[model samples]
Target: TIASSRLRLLEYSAFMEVQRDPDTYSKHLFVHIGQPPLEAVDVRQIYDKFPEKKGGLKELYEKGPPNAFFLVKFWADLNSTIQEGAFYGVSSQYSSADSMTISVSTKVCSFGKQVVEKVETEYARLENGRFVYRIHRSPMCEYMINFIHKLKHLPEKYMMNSVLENFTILQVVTSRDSQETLLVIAFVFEVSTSEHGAQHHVYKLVKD
Candidate 1:
């Protein structure tokens, strides 16, 4: 798993520049979630929360902000529904409309949940007629009973439990109930995007 996520903007202005559009100015930054090394992850709230951190832009937009020039220059939550891409689908509950701010609370949330979501592994054959990768268990359904019996024969590479949310799963997803550990394995792929008239990379978990 990647220790954490680091972002480097690739022509963001090209996107924000669109605030100039008449019809689509109302558009929001789409949040991308899924796959590991999650590339093109677009969290809509960034249109306001992140930019607001900049004093110059904040003042420029906060004071009678422009029209189609910045459709959502005034940041604020309108609703919550995540368009699937990579990470946990967060609704627009914390995003602000004015003075843009991305919000998360250690008090309201915990960095420690269940287990790490992503892990690097080599494809290998560990037993006769058996295949294995790094991930040791499938844990998305313990809270429900339907999964308990269905996954019994899974290799240690495909058995186990829980993972933390807030991202497209990655890193030491240590468990909450005990010191148990999980090994995660994933792959990345590039896809075309209409927004930039180009392609963006995304990470995805492979099923056993």
Candidate 2:
């Protein structure tokens, strides 16, 4: 059931990255709500909401605020319609304009209402096949969901609920693009779901 003036909740796709037009000034990162992450096509409000550095390239190139990670979320109403992308020229409400002055909020406003609850393990899962990978169900599951929510699953694409089994420890390194890598303490899991029948999902602390 959807509430008025709220962005209807939709299943997550994947945490994504919004690219800054190399030629353009602002290098604000952004993400899409649908499949196959595309830098060009996405909701304007969310992208605009992403915090940008001052002086554009000069700051990134000169000051080097140094690379950092940001958490972002996308929401839309049930009747929401997507804006089309444009390669050049100024943007209109109907056109693709990535500039935004408002602060980013996890709660999306367009038509439907939203609810974000704290992670509670006991009631996190029900027998109805909902939240199959919830934290309370398992400690590893809990860690996985929290990590995804705080780190990847927002602006990025949706990661389906996982089935936790066959755990292993590994020295992991996480990276973005062909960028540098850092060694970190990480874990691995073998996950599979009835929804994606017979597909073996052997992933690490974070899957790129």
Question: Could you say which candidate leads in lDDT?
Answer: 1
lDDT string for model 2 (1-208, tens) is 1101111112122221223465644211121222112122122222232222552222222332122211222221111012222221111011011211211112211112122212211112233433222111111234333543343333322232222112222211222232222221112222222332222111112112
- Give the local distance difference test score of model 2: 0.21
Model 1: residues >4 Å from true position, as ranges?
A: 1-30, 34-171, 183-208
Q: Across residues 16-88, which tens digit of lDDT does each residue of candidate 1 receive?
A: 1123334633332322221234323222322232222432223333431121011111111112122221221
TM-score, one value per model: 0.16, 0.15
True lDDT of residue 8, candidate 1:
12
> In angstroms, what RMSD does candidate 1 have relative to the true structure?
22.1
Each candidate's lDDT (Cα)? 0.22, 0.21
- Highest TM-score: give the candidate number: 1
* Residue-level lDDT for 24 in candidate 2: 40
